[PDB]
Design a protein around this ligand. Structure first.
Ligand SMILES: [Mg+2]
Ligand SMILES: [Zn+2]
Lengths: 104, 263, 158, 37, 83, 94, 169, 1107
RNA sequence: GGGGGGGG
DNA sequence: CCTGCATCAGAGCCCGAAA
């Protein structure tokens, strides 16, 4: 069906989690020698998606006959790497934190 | 975080604003498990707020967080959305486009009002997809992939290419724009007449609408692709169909300078 | 149609109108240095004097053109609307006129030269304050206009 | 622009804006007054 | 009520319009609270979406107009008139 | 100017309707290879190449000239849009 | 401290290179080359290892850096996206599979199906000897043979349909 | 040819050395040429002497030295190094506790050296540091805007060396003092410095209501120590007011001659205004254990007397050039130097506490890094260090003489943009940028010198009673307003004042006075204008707005291979090239030994044999060819200061930014329209307006984690035709014609895990080629560029003398040259601000031509003149006409130049050659000259009833000519102005600017076309362009721009597929950057969703983000 | 806590 | 009740922009 409206509304912590594919646990980015993304860091493929299309991280499942499988060894979905543009993560706060827009 | 030409790395500011958040959350988690005094837990809890507040809207409250050894505020999500360089005004209400080009402007007294002179080397590129298709329907290349290979090197362009182009752009218009586009005739459609040389030829009568001099002005070219876009241009945006001002109702295309002088 | 220096014709009427101006101008300073009328009153009445003198020479420039040189290039281009307006032409043939101090208030002494005649260095420096003030003004304006327009589009686009 | 009655679907609002704004550069109370109004 | 153009603009229904104008966080804050739905009535909204603007060739007045040649037009009409 | 544009604005209540008809029709012919054209071999818009006259490839040129003849009909809710598609592909294949 | 976090002892080595160099420069009255650092570091250190230590120490730069001017220029705006295919590339890859299968079916699709099962249009089904023991239609060394005959029938089939040369780049 | 000089004005003094604002400033800052005792306490010396001694043990500073540069100038340019000297400092460590003293010479790093012409080389590129104008420090009194009868005194120090302070007297009646946006009763401070109620009343009493308004009893209930703590609580709440730390805060704030610095100039101006003498450059002292006032009461005293209308008390005009000074190169750099010194001192005191308080030397105590980085940052990234403008030699000379009011310490986002009456003779009123920056950036006037305190002064002649001395006194704006200063042109017999009424100024106001009344006289007219402005003949006849463009475009003239000086000069074009240093001159008298294309060797009287090598075909920052040409022949005898080689855009040592061309001034069938220009193909034929341009191309081979990049001749899949002009190792051979797509440098890179797709390996399986593992990464020629390879530079890892940034093996550079003939699109201009793009090139047979057959070079439209009011170009060509037939060039000084009767005199002499020859060799008047003459007589141009010869002379004296249209042979119905004009070819060439793009690179995040020709960018269709399509109602054109033609990835790939297959483009999909907006709003915890008619959600991600 | 060398 | 009075978010377009 066709787009006719655009709604905007608050997001519950519940719903933020409904978006999320993984909690980002580490401030790491990419490993300094593999330059591949560190797992549970800010670029982890296990959360956000494969870097290369229809190919897992360690290389066990490498093309499209598997679409949607999650590699046992490395844990990455086999889809189009375009997903790294869409898949949200999330950070579980210890203490709650106010959203400054609604404060100031 | 991308490797740019150099093997160097280049990274968006949000990553450093997230890292500051993650450290503080993580360390608060540990100070809790280790039962630290509340003056310590209080201090981190407040720093956590400020990490969240610089991520969401750095600078909004208190000192803006900066990269070490730089005075540059990190650009936070609010910064991205907002302002002249923000998402809305820089990439949603207006983008850069394909099938466009720019050159210096030159008067073309011999043009008819619906025309302009368009450099053929420009026209080659702006219409290049079309040119490839024509190139194979005749025969100057076996298929579209060889056709493109041929126009890569300037030495390997042979004269019958240009006759192929002329066929392509037949009847089609291009758009001309001179910034600042103050009103709707900052853009107007012209049937292009290919020219040697590198300069666009503008028709004398349209210079007023455009506020176009020839003291080095330049003008952008745009090629409407679909049948729909081309029909809009030819009917609604053709120079010849817009002779009157939409503001006063008076003639906009009119004699001026030499044309008056001679008459 | 061409333009050579001789095509910017100083009217004979010009010298007479200038002598008329100085004899009335010394009328005004005796009324000052004898204390009949103010220094504000005197600055005011010489400004209107030189304004009227400027107008006088402008129509002088065009009457001499129309009657004696009706096909002069400057006359033709201005008259037909091809290019130039009276006070531009007035500056080539008559006098440059009153300039303005940085503050905006005008100088009492005008530029008596024309561009054909050529300005004195002091006339040229005097006239520069106005040019520069105009150039800055226009530069701040286009931003104010640009913003205005975006507001308008924003309020009417639907 | 057409010396004739307006076609259903013309983006008048935009046109109106462009019409008022374009002379903008050349206003020497001048343009401030207009903003004030 | 008389407001000038800036405040008038920022007060339209369309939050995609106002947020893209100015005062973006304020505009977005209040809208998100209200659960505002943009009906995409004006042109900026549809520009932001890359949709086809509701003017010109995009007006619902002229958009659905059909064109048929007479040869097709009654070639079709004959097969559909009978049972 | 577009040949006969003053007449083409005579045709419509609203200028944007003219160009909708024109653009629609222009893709009608490009899809059907022009074979559904209303015009006859001497009305066909021609284009001069180096070899000689050939058909004008530009279907927007075509549609406006077609339109001027008056053999096209235009309007809203003429016919269910799906039912056109195949009877046109039936009469003039691709 | 580093956007690319690096092990704690490796940073300890990097910090040492800098202290080493700074004293070097402090006595030499000019910037040392990697060799003068390498020996000042003792055994195990050559100049290539000074050099690869510094490339590791390199910190990333901000996509939001202003390109001088500071008005209207970001570094990131100068950086092309080389991941997503361009319209030509996506068209070239489509074009290839289009005439790739319109060339297998033109001998027969069966022996082109055996070969197509060998490499894989979408899957990459490439091992070597064994699995072929199962379902192609025949036993095991025959698939390798009809591999060649499909390949060389392809190669004559292509000397006529020589439109694939261009894909060689 | 003969040159004729006009002008009655005898100039007592030549122009000063015009780069002296740069050279003298840095030389004074470094003092490298002075023995360290003898150094005065300025610049580098002053920074050291203010940073040291460093207290705890004490590190003290002995002297500094500067070594010689590790590499010479051109050597630095070649290898992308900075031209700089090693800086060493000898310091003695002294232990306060024991008595140990170890002293060593510590290396502080390198300081960049300035070249002879007053520029720098920073990583291989020339740069210029532009002087900054700002408010002089001192004490100022301005009127209170809100309260009319009141005034604010302000004390303002050097930038970043103290706070600014206001002394508003609030409605309350007390004297209030503003600091750091904080207000408080100033009398609070008064007590702190040891005042009490008697001293305030005895000194100040005269002001009935005002002096008693400062008195507040609760504050005196308190000795000076109490009041010290008083205030500290005011200004940093929460900090415990320890008597120790309140002292330190306010001391460092107010009296610390290290954290607070008024100028050396600020010190004098304060002494002069308040009528005091200052012990140092701080507002107060700490002496004998308590605070001692310096400034505050003279400042308070001055304000109260002005309040009351006491005589001798005046407001200060803050725009007056006596209260505004310039921060030259030296000052600017030493400011950055002192900052880096003070940073290094933070590291010294830190290390004077850790690590063994005895086992330490100066060497291990100092870390150079914070000084090195401070200087490197001032030079590479400061916004006053500019990429040199060396388009032509004048470009760089104007650059050095520029004055910016932006910068760290000037304006930014009318009063300061205005021409102030004190600019006269100091800052050019004409040369300034059109646009947003107008009046913020300006140029040093020609005779102006910047003095020790940084005020601009201008020369003036003293006049005694009535006779004009030859003594010249350079004068700041403040001292100028005391005197009556006569105009430069006022008439004089010998040295006596010859008019009984003289035109003079007094405080910039113009006044008529007698010769008894005059105290000084202007040196020259040139002293009021910049160098560029001074290069405009007949400037007295040009409206200023167009003279403004005449100035600035001379900066932009590109060096022509046939460059020639203008037929009408002003007399400054000789020393411009001399001070430019483009041309090369003779040191002493002597005899030329040898003359080569590459070299010229001269033997002087000294016996020495000096060899001058010549820079030939060197590429400037802007790509224009800097090239010196030998102008003397072997054996020629030469004096001191004679010229030996012409620089670029110089002809026989005169500045040559264009060519003299024969111009007719008439419309021409529409190709003249709205400033376009019509030129004759004759100019291309004889290589007029042809210029050489070199672009530089670079490429690096790097070590990658996939393996090495190698600069190869072996490139997968490419024919020998593609590689013919490549040498053995894969770089193009010197002297090859390279055109777009050609390869200049071969290079292979290892293919990423893009490991040929199964689709690809099968493909190459069939051809029996196995896919190589290296990719073609060669450096090719970009679209629209090209030329002939003239040079290659190859720098590898492991060669002697070379090691590159970490990771890169080898870097190759290829210099490509082009000879660019003039073409339609390219920009011409004259010195009067007439500018136009050449729109048409007619063949010689279409050009209007004179009756004796010679055709004009360029046709300019007259419509360009009346509204622009730049009549100087009109006189320029008249005199050009005379000179064309007489074979002369002329020197008409500005404002003292050739006047109409004088030009007619030489025009008459010219007519005899144009016409007397004609009748001589057997030809009479032409039938067509009679038809023109007929209509000219109807225009009142010729007197009726004279022979055709008599009447053509009358037209020739008006500058007009009989012209025959080459197309018809029939005459132009009127007599037309024709003459020689100086017209430059500006740097804006269409070859540089044409650009077009079908598809190309896209931005990382937004997936929208990149920008800019160099990126194969796409044009920006912005906000106002959408409005344009919106008004037109071009909904489908507009939607195309918003999708297919930008970031609608599916629709853009699909559209491209449709066109190369001949179908119409598919209706678009969702722009990727709206998808980006959604996810950024989710990143702000905002749930934005697309719905349908029935309000059911619509998934814009085609299921790809839902689980 | 908001801003700049060139072209139109 | 109203006014000072404070806190915030605005400040033209496109292209070279010489990092
Ligand atoms: Mg212009
Ligand atoms: Zn895996």
């Amino acid at each position: 069906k066709e787009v006719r409206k655009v709604r905007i509304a608050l997001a519950s912590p519940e719903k933020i989690r409904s978006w999320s594919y993984g909690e980002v646990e580490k401030p790491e980015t990419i490993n300094y020698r593999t330059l591949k993304p560190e797992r549970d860091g800010l670029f982890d493929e296990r959360i956000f998606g494969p870097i290369k299309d229809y190919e897992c991280a360690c290389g066990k499942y490498k093309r499209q006959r598997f679409e949607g499988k999650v590699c046992e060894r490395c844990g990455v979905e086999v889809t189009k790497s375009i997903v790294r543009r869409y898949r949200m993560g999330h950070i579980e706060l210890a203490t709650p934190a106010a959203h400054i827009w609604f404060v100031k | 975080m991308v490797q740019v030409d150099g093997g160097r790395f280049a990274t968006s500011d949000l990553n450093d604003l997230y890292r500051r958040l993650i450290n503080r959350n993580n360390r608060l988690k540990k100070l809790l498990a280790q039962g630290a005094p509340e003056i310590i837990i209080r201090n981190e809890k407040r720093m956590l707020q400020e990490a969240v507040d610089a991520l969401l809207d750095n600078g909004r409250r208190g000192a803006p967080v900066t990269n070490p050894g730089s005075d540059r505020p990190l650009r936070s999500l609010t910064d991205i959305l907002s302002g002249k360089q923000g998402r809305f005004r820089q990439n949603l209400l207006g983008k850069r486009v394909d099938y466009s080009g720019r050159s210096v402007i030159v008067v073309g007294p011999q043009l008819k009002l619906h025309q302009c002179g368009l450099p053929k080397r420009m026209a080659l590129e702006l219409f290049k997809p079309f040119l490839l298709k024509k190139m194979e329907e005749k025969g100057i290349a076996p298929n579209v992939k060889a056709a493109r290979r041929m126009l890569e090197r300037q030495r390997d362009i042979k004269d019958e290419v240009w006759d192929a182009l002329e066929e392509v752009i037949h009847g089609k218009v291009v758009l001309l724009n001179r910034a600042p586009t103050l009103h709707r005739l900052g853009i107007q459609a012209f049937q292009p007449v290919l020219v040697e040389g590198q300069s666009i030829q503008l028709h004398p009568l349209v210079c007023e609408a455009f506020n176009a001099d020839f003291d080095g002005d330049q003008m952008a070219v745009h090629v409407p692709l679909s049948s729909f876009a081309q029909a809009e241009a030819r009917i609604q945006m053709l120079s010849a169909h817009n002779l009157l001002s939409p503001a006063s109702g008076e003639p906009l295309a009119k004699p001026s300078r030499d044309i008056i002088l001679g008459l | 149609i061409t333009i050579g220096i001789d095509d910017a014709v100083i009217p004979e009427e010009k010298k007479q109108y200038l002598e008329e101006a100085d004899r009335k101008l010394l009328q005004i300073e005796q009324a000052y240095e004898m204390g009949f009328l103010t220094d504000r009153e005197r600055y005011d009445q010489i400004l209107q004097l030189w304004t009227e003198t400027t107008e006088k020479v402008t129509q002088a420039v065009f009457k001499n053109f129309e009657e004696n040189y009706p096909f002069n290039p400057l006359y033709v281009m201005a008259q037909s609307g091809a290019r130039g307006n009276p006070q531009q032409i007035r500056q080539l043939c008559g006098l440059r006129g009153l300039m303005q101090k940085p503050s905006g208030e005008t100088f009492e002494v005008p530029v008596r030269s024309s561009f054909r005649e050529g300005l004195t260095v002091l006339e040229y420096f005097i006239s520069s304050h106005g040019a520069r003030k105009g150039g800055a003004d226009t530069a701040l304006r286009t931003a104010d206009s640009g913003y205005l327009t975006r507001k308008l589009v924003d309020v009417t686009h639907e | 622009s057409m010396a004739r009655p307006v076609s259903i679907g013309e983006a008048v609002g935009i046109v109106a804006a462009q019409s008022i704004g374009e002379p903008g550069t050349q206003l020497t109370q001048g343009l401030p007054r207009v903003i004030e109004l | 009520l008389l407001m000038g153009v800036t405040k008038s603009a920022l007060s339209t229904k369309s939050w995609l319009s106002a947020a893209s104008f100015q005062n973006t966080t304020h505009v977005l804050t209040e809208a998100a609270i209200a659960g505002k739905k943009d009906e995409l009535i004006g042109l900026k909204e549809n520009v932001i979406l890359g949709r086809l603007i509701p003017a010109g060739t995009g007006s619902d007045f002229v958009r659905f107009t059909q064109v048929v040649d007479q040869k097709t037009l009654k070639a079709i009409e004959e097969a559909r008139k009978e049972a | 100017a577009e040949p006969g544009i003053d007449k083409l604005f005579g045709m419509v209540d609203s200028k944007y309707r003219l160009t909708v008809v024109v653009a629609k029709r222009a893709q009608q012919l490009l899809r059907h290879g022009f074979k559904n054209t209303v015009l006859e071999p001497e009305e066909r818009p021609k284009m001069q190449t180096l070899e000689g006259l050939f058909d004008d490839p530009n279907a927007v040129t075509w549609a406006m000239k077609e339109l001027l003849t008056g053999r096209l009909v235009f309007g809203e809710n003429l016919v269910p849009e799906d039912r056109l598609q195949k009877e046109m592909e039936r009469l003039y294949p691709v | 401290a580093r956007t690319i976090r690096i092990p704690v002892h490796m940073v300890e080595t990097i910090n040492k290179l800098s202290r080493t160099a700074r004293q070097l420069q402090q006595e030499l009255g000019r910037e040392p080359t990697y060799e003068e650092i390498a020996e000042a570091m003792g055994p195990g250190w050559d100049a290539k290892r000074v050099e690869e230590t510094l490339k590791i120490a390199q910190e990333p730069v901000s996509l939001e850096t202003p390109i001088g001017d500071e008005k209207d220029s970001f570094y990131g705006d100068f950086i092309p996206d080389e991941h997503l295919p361009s319209p030509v590339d996506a068209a070239t890859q489509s074009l290839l599979s289009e005439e790739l299968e319109k060339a297998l079916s033109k001998l027969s699709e069966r022996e082109a199906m055996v070969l197509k099962l060998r490499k894989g249009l979408i899957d990459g089904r490439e091992h070597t000897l064994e699995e072929v023991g199962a379902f192609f239609g025949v036993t095991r060394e025959r698939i390798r043979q009809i591999e060649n005959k499909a390949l060389r029938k392809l190669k004559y089939h292509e000397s006529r349909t020589r439109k694939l040369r261009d894909f060689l780049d | 040819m003969e040159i004729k000089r006009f002008g009655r004005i005898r100039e007592v003094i030549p122009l000063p050395p015009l780069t002296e604002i740069q050279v003298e400033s840095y030389r004074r800052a470094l003092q490298a040429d002075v023995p360290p005792e003898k150094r005065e306490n300025v610049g580098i010396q002053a920074a050291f002497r203010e940073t040291f001694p460093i207290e705890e043990l004490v590190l003290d500073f002995l002297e500094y030295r500067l070594g010689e540069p590790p590499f010479p100038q051109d050597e630095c340019r070649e290898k992308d190094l900075t031209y700089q000297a090693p800086l060493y400092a000898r310091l003695q460590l002294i232990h306060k506790d024991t008595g140990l003293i170890k002293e060593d010479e510590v290396f502080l790093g390198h300081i960049p050296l300035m070249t002879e012409d007053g520029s720098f080389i920073i990583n291989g590129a020339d740069r210029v540091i532009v002087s900054q104008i700002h408010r002089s420090p001192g004490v100022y009194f301005t009127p209170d805007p809100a309260r009319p009868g009141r005034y604010i005194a302000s004390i303002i120090p050097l930038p970043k060396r103290g706070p600014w302070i206001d002394l508003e007297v609030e409605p309350n009646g007390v004297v209030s003092m503003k600091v750091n946006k904080r207000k408080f009763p100033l009398v609070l401070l008064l007590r702190v410095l040891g005042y009490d109620q008697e001293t305030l009343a005895r000194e100040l009493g005269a002001y009935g209501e005002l002096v008693q308004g400062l008195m507040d009893e609760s504050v005196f209930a308190m000795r000076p120590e109490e009041a010290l703590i008083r205030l500290f609580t005011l200004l940093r709440p929460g900090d415990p007011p320890k008597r120790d730390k309140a002292v330190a805060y306010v001391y460092g704030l107010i009296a610390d001659p290290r954290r607070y610095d008024l100028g050396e100039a600020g010190r004098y101006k304060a002494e002069e205004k308040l009528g005091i003498r200052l012990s140092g450059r701080t507002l107060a002292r700490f002496e004998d254990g308590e605070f001692k006032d310096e400034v505050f009461l003279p400042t308070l005293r001055y304000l109260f007397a002005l309040t009351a209308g006491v005589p001798g008390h005046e407001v200060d005009d803050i725009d007056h050039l006596g209260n505004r000074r310039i921060r030259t190169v030296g000052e600017l750099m030493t400011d950055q130097f002192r900052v880096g010194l003070a940073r290094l001192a933070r590291g010294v005191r830190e290390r004077m506490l850790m690590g063994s308080e005895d086992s330490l030397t100066p060497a291990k105590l100092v870390n150079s890094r914070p000084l090195e980085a401070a200087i490197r940052e001032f030079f590479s990234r400061s916004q006053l260090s500019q990429f040199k403008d060396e388009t032509n030699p004048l470009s760089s000379l104007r650059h050095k003489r520029r004055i910016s009011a932006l910068g760290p310490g000037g304006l930014t986002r009318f009063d300061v943009r205005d021409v102030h009456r004190t600019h006269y003779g100091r800052i050019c009123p004409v040369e300034t940028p059109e646009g947003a920056n107008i009046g913020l950036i300006t140029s040093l006037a020609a005779y102006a010198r910047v003095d020790e305190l940084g005020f601009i002064r201008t020369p003036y002649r003293r006049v005694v009673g009535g006779v004009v001395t030859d003594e010249v006194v350079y004068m700041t704006a403040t001292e100028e307003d005391r005197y009556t200063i006569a105009q430069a042109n006022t008439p004089l017999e010998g040295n006596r004042i010859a008019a009984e009424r003289v035109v003079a100024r007094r405080k910039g106001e113009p006044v008529i006075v007698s010769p008894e009344e005059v105290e000084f006289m202007d040196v020259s007219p040139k002293q009021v204008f910049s160098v560029n402005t001074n290069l405009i003949p007949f400037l007295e006849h040009d409206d200023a707005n167009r003279a403004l463009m005449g100035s600035n475009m001379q900066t932009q003239a590109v060096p022509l291979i046939r460059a020639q000086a203008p037929v009408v000069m002003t007399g400054l074009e000789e020393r411009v090239v001399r001070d430019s240093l483009a041309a090369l001159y003779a040191e002493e008298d002597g005899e030329v030994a040898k003359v080569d294309g590459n070299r010229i060797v001269v033997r002087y009287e000294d016996g020495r044999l000096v060899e001058y090598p010549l820079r030939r075909f060197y590429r400037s920052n802007q790509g224009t060819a800097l090239d010196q040409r030998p102008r003397v022949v072997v054996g020629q005898r030469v004096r001191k200061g004679d010229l030996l080689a012409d620089g670029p855009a110089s002809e026989n040592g005169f500045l040559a930014l264009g060519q003299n061309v024969l111009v007719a001034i008439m419309p021409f069938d529409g190709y003249n329209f709205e400033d376009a220009i019509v030129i004759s193909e004759e100019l291309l034929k004889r290589d007029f307006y042809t210029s050489i341009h070199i672009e530089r191309y670079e490429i690096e081979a790097r070590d990658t984690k996939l393996g090495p990049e190698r600069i190869t001749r072996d490139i997968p899949h490419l024919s020998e035709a593609a590689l013919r002009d490549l040498d053995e190792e894969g770089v193009v051979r010197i002297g090859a014609e390279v055109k777009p797509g050609d390869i200049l440098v071969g290079r292979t890179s290892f293919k990423g895990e893009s490991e040929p797709t199964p689709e690809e390996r099968l493909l190459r399986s069939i051809f029996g080629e196995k896919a190589r593992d290296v990719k073609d990464t060669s450096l090719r020629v970009p679209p629209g560029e090209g030329g002939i390879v003239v040079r290659t530079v190859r720098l590898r890892r492991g060669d002697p003398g070379v090691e590159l940034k970490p990771g890169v093996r080898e870097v190759v550079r290829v210099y490509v040259a082009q000879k660019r003939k003039l073409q339609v699109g390219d920009k011409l201009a004259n010195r009067h601000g007439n500018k136009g793009v050449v729109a048409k090139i007619l063949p010689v047979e279409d050009m209007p031509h004179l009756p004796d057959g010679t055709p004009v070079d360029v046709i300019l439209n007259p419509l360009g003149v009346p509204s622009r009011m730049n009549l100087g170009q009109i006189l320029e060509t008249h005199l050009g006409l005379a000179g064309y037939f007489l074979g002369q060039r002329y020197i008409s000084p500005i404002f003292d130049g050739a006047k109409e009767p004088e030009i007619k005199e030489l025009l008459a002499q010219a007519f005899e050659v144009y016409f007397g020859k004609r009748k001589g060799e057997g030809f009479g008047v032409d039938k067509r000259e009679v038809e023109v003459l007929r209509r000219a007589e109807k225009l009142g141009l010729v007197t009726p009833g004279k022979t055709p010869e008599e009447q053509l002379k009358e037209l020739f004296l008006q500058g007009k000519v009989v012209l025959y249209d080459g197309r018809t042979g029939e005459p132009i119905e009127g007599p037309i102005v024709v003459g020689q004009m100086f017209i430059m070819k500006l740097y804006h060439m269409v070859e540089d600017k044409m650009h077009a793009r079908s598809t190309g690179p896209y931005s990382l995040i937004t997936q929208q076309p990149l920008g800019g020709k160099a990126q194969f960018g796409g044009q920006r269709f912005g906000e106002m362009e959408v409005w344009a399509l919106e008004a037109y109602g071009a909904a489908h054109t507009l939607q195309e721009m918003l999708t297919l033609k930008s970031d609608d990835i599916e629709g853009r790939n699909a559209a491209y597929e449709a066109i190369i297959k001949g179908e119409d483009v598919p209706e678009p999909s969702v722009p990727e950057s709206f998808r980006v907006l959604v996810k950024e709003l989710q990143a702000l915890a905002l749930d934005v969703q697309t719905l349908d008619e029935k309000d059911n959600p619509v998934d814009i991600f085609e299921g790809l983000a839902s689980k």
